[PDB]
Symmetry: C3
Subunit: 90 residues, 3 copies
């Protein structure tokens, strides 16, 4: 078929993050104004969406990774990706 991407950006430089789901794995490419590099994000999933917001100059990111009917939320809040509270039902 084809890979699936999600993108987000922030600030005025801007920083950009592109998430790619490929063969069950989601990886991350980053731009902070100079060039593209690989980011810390590495999680399983066949589909991905993303949103982010600033608190002052600190970025917060939520990546929604889906495999089958299970969507897991992954959070960046300044110190590592942690799994989020998101659930699909209830």
């Amino acid at each position: 078929g084809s890979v699936q991407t999600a993108a987000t950006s922030w600030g005025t430089v801007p920083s950009i993050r592109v998430y790619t789901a490929n063969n069950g794995k989601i990886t991350e490419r980053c731009w902070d104004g100079k060039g593209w590099y690989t980011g810390a994000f590495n999680e399983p999933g066949d589909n991905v969406s993303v949103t982010s917001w600033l608190v002052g100059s600190a970025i917060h990111i939520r990546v929604y990774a889906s495999t089958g009917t299970t969507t897991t939320e992954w959070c960046w809040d300044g110190n590592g990706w942690t799994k989020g509270a998101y659930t699909a039902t209830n």
Copy 2:
């Protein structure tokens, strides 16, 4: 295969909305700072994207739901989801 999601967020809390297309139906999970709950959005579609913007503190949301080659726009503007003017051609 797998479900497909789209996500958007606003404000500083933030509020978050995650839309999930699953088996022809798009449903909505919401976060306003405390926990996740099911939102009012319920429309047919196999694919979804979303964008939103603030006017002061009031949120406006546009959800693009696609089935086959027909994309329908759905609008939140403070008082219920209504169908939008979006058309694909002409």
Copy 3:
């Protein structure tokens, strides 16, 4: 199957752009406050994501178009779509 869309918006009017991948081709519909029209964007791809940001009142847009395992970045910066520096690896 079904077409795939990505959406972005900016400003307070707002302007909206909806990108649709359909049968290998990504096209663009635009809203600047009056009605929907077809935009300049026309590129190959089976999947698309998008992000955008303002610098003052000038919009900058990045559209990520994927075919197979090749994601090409397309840039709008006020004067035509140009191909971006994005690469997936290295």
